[PDB]
């Protein structure tokens, strides 16, 4: 019940999804062939929320992998944990978006979106009581951004009741992996604030810094970062994929973390994060995790929370623990950081507790903070956009697909409206 459907757009989306399904299968004890070899019945008590039991007692992910080029698709397909996806789900195009959002949302995407929606509809009808959708994508690449926004708009048209999650890799503040990413980012944010229930802003820069500083890895391959983000998502869903002393679902998180329709952007965080040697030299206590999850150096969004206020906060633990301990820790952390919280929201911490650790560990924790600091991000992007739009650089590439200047004008206006609202609620009284 509460079946969840997974969508993966863009190269980053597909890679993250591959690592994610690896992690999920490892949690549920699922062989690479797709059949179960696990040991605990609770694995299969809710295997149906993410998997479908194909006949002859096999399991397939309920995912939909989308692309405009066969490269990364085939790369995943050849790799292990690839031969379990149902092959009909691999929808891909040939032209390639060329890292352009206009192609990914007007010209190229408009031709595959129909087949994608058909597969979506088939999967929806297969499910018993649909819970919602989770989209894994970037915001810079043309395919991910454009096609994901298109699919989100279409789905929200076809499902104004279900829940929607997006795991977008926001561009880093310092570096810029592409050149035209401000345009795609602005348009994608426009569509997201239009029709998304919640958005999980994530930066590669913060992941780099976490892997280097905290985990003491000077050689972080993209597999590691995707490994971390997938662990985060799995921790998000484990509250319903497994029993718990205080269970939660996606709907509860949306209710608790979104006081206003537009202000649904969240910075995540994970704990504990220990090196290979520096692990046994620390006590794995709930206060330790709690204090770990509250600092700049462990936020997966490159923005110091101290610059703003924590509008809302959610926290999902795992494994056996004592509830009173968690309550006391949350109380202390809310007391000591009094200046860092919204005044008119008392007791702004949502708590969920699971019974299963994510394997290997005794107790883990996931943090989902909706703060006012993230506005800086948008501010930054907005400024850049204006610059690149004042000289109308690269404007012809997007113009040639039917888009016009007024599109960018409206998107920038909308972004500045959102920034104004965020600042307004930051200094509310």
């Amino acid at each position: 019940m509460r079946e969840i459907v997974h969508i993966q757009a863009g190269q980053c989306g597909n890679q993250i999804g591959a690592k994610f399904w690896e992690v999920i299968s490892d949690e549920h004890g699922i062989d690479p062939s797709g059949n179960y070899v696990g040991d605990s019945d609770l694995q299969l008590e809710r295997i149906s929320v993410y998997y479908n039991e194909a006949s002859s007692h096999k399991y397939v992910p309920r995912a939909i992998l989308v692309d405009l080029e066969p490269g990364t698709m085939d790369s995943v397909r050849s790799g292990a944990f690839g031969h379990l996806f149902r092959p009909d789900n691999f929808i891909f195009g040939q032209s390639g978006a060329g890292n352009n959002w206009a192609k990914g949302h007007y010209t190229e995407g408009a031709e595959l979106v129909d087949s994608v929606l058909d597969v979506v509809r088939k999967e929806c009808e297969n499910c018993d009581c649909l819970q919602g959708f989770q989209l894994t994508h970037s915001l810079g690449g043309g395919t991910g951004s454009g096609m994901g926004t298109l699919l989100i708009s279409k789905v929200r048209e076809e499902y104004p009741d279900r829940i929607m999650n997006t795991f977008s890799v926001v561009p880093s503040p310092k570096v810029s992996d592409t050149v035209v990413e401000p345009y795609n980012a602005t348009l994608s944010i426009h569509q997201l604030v239009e029709n998304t229930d919640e958005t999980y802003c994530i930066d590669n820069e913060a992941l780099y810094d976490i892997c280097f500083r905290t985990l003491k890895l000077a050689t972080p391959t993209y597999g590691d970062l995707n490994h971390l983000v997938s662990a985060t998502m799995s921790g998000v869903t484990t509250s319903l994929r497994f029993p718990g002393q205080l269970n939660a679902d996606l709907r509860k998180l949306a209710v608790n973390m979104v006081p206003f329709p537009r202000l649904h952007f969240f910075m995540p965080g994970f704990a504990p994060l220990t090196a290979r040697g520096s692990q046994q030299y620390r006590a794995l206590t709930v206060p330790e995790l709690t204090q770990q999850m509250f600092d700049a150096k462990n936020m997966m969004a490159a923005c110091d929370p101290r610059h703003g206020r924590y509008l809302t906060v959610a926290t999902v633990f795992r494994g056996r623990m004592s509830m009173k301990e968690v309550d006391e820790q949350m109380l202390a952390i809310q007391s000591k950081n009094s200046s860092y919280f919204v005044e008119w929201i008392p007791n702004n911490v949502k708590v969920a507790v699971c019974d299963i650790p994510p394997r290997g560990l005794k107790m883990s924790s996931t943090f989902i903070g909706n703060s006012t600091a993230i506005q800086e991000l948008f501010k930054r992007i907005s400024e850049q956009f204006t610059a690149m739009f004042r000289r109308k650089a690269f404007l012809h590439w997007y113009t040639g697909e039917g888009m016009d200047e007024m599109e960018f004008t409206e998107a920038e206006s909308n972004m500045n409206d959102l920034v104004s609202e965020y600042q307004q609620y930051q200094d509310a009284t």
């Binding site: 019940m1 008590e45 709907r251 809302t312 109380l331 929201i345 708590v351």
Partner: protein, 435 residues
């Protein structure tokens, strides 16, 4: 022959019920499968029986998220429950009162009422209802408001007891607790016979300080509240020197129709290692019950006035000692009843000692006393909620979920007005009379 069904709504309700039915099965020597290898019948009031030696509870487990109910179905108490009693929804209200009272619960309420009516008609001397529900969760508040309205419509004058979980002043697991709490209170204020205030914060404090367990699990709090409820119904379920029914509870502890919110307290609560070194005097345990640090609601009773008290004793108890202890309590100054109620006590005595659950945390005691006390300090607690509500309403935060799920803003204004009126009535009672 004096039956009383049990209703468990929401995750808190179901877990508390797990603990309570474990305790009951231990009380009457009943296997998890309903078999059994001073006692009267006794268990007939809460257990129905079939032809074989198999007994079933008179309980209803209703929830909108199948997780916990499925755990029950897989729990060691699997063979116990009649499978039809385990009503499961599909999507939980998700801490949203509107969903739990207008959208989702509205579509299984009829089946729930059907099972209720079946179990009622199968019984003969039905005393009343026992509702076990939280206050913040969407299912709890919403489904409970709906259920109370339906029951009051159907079963007009029968006992309806509630066990809410008052949200702590500082430990709030949810974020939208004030909204759901205000709505459910504004609704239930006109249907509930008698509530029973309990909070998790106070139970944490008690478990740490008295039982000397620093890191308690929800199971422990559930055991405590189950002990309380067992003490409440022991009079019905056992022979005592001075028995008492739920009708007497509602009559004695409710002076005014709106003011029916007594808080709970229990004693003795000491560790088994500390079981010795204290003889557990009846006056001693009475004083323990009256101590502000042993109460199960974070409210200093010295800030209010005990409008009524109900002390229920079980075990080796002798009436004269109870009388002496109560007189001594009346002598003390810091316990100032309302002037217009000179008789602030109803007493109950039972012969059956409380039973300690093996694998538990408490120690086998020969005597026990549960105090259900309706005081005036509770008013202050409402104020706190009031405050929070205003805040979350001064910015219209989170409103859109409730609006779009079958509710109007004027309803929120009306609920605030009703809570303010209740606080006003509490203050009005708090004053003293002239002449």
């Amino acid at each position: 022959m004096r039956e009383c069904i049990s209703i468990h709504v929401g995750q808190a309700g179901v877990q508390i019920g797990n603990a309570c039915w474990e305790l009951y099965c231990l009380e009457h020597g009943i296997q998890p499968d309903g078999q059994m290898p001073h006692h009267h019948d006794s268990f007939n009031t809460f257990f129905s029986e079939t032809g074989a030696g198999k007994h079933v509870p008179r309980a209803v487990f209703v929830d909108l998220e199948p997780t916990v109910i499925d755990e029950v179905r897989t729990g060691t108490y699997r063979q116990l429950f009649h499978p039809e009693q385990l009503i499961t929804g599909k999507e939980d209200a998700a801490n949203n009162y509107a969903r739990g009272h207008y959208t989702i619960g509205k579509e299984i309420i009829d089946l729930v009422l059907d099972r209720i009516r079946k179990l009622a008609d199968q019984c003969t001397g039905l005393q009343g209802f026992l509702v076990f529900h939280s206050f913040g969760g969407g299912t709890g508040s919403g489904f409970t408001s709906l259920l109370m309205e339906r029951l009051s419509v159907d079963y007009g004058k029968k006992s309806k007891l509630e066990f809410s979980i008052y949200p702590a002043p500082q430990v709030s697991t949810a974020v939208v607790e004030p909204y759901n709490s205000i709505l459910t209170t504004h609704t239930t204020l006109e249907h509930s016979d008698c509530a029973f205030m309990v909070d998790n914060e106070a139970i944490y404090d008690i478990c740490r300080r008295n039982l000397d367990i620093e890191r308690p699990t929800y199971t422990n709090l559930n055991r405590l509240i189950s002990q309380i409820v067992s003490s409440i119904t022991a009079s019905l379920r056992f022979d005592g020197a001075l028995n008492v029914d739920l009708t007497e509870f509602q009559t004695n502890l409710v002076p005014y129709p709106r003011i029916h919110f007594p808080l709970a307290t229990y004693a003795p609560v000491i560790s088994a290692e500390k079981a010795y070194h204290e003889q557990l005097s009846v006056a001693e345990i009475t004083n323990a019950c009256f101590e502000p640090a042993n109460q199960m609601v974070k409210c200093d009773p010295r800030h209010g006035k005990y409008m009524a008290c109900c002390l229920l004793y079980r075990g080796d108890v002798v009436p004269k000692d109870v009388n002496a202890a109560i007189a001594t309590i009346k002598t003390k100054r810091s316990i100032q009843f309302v002037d217009w109620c000179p008789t602030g006590f109803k007493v109950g005595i039972n012969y059956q000692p409380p039973t300690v659950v093996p694998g538990g945390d408490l120690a086998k005691v020969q005597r026990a006393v549960c105090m259900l006390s309706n005081t005036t300090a509770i008013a202050e607690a409402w104020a706190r909620l009031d405050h929070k509500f205003d805040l979350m309403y001064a910015k219209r935060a989170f409103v859109h979920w409730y609006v779009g799920e079958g509710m109007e803003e004027g309803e929120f204004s009306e609920a605030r007005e009703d809570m303010a009126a209740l606080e006003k009535d509490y203050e009005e009672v708090g004053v003293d009379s002239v002449e």
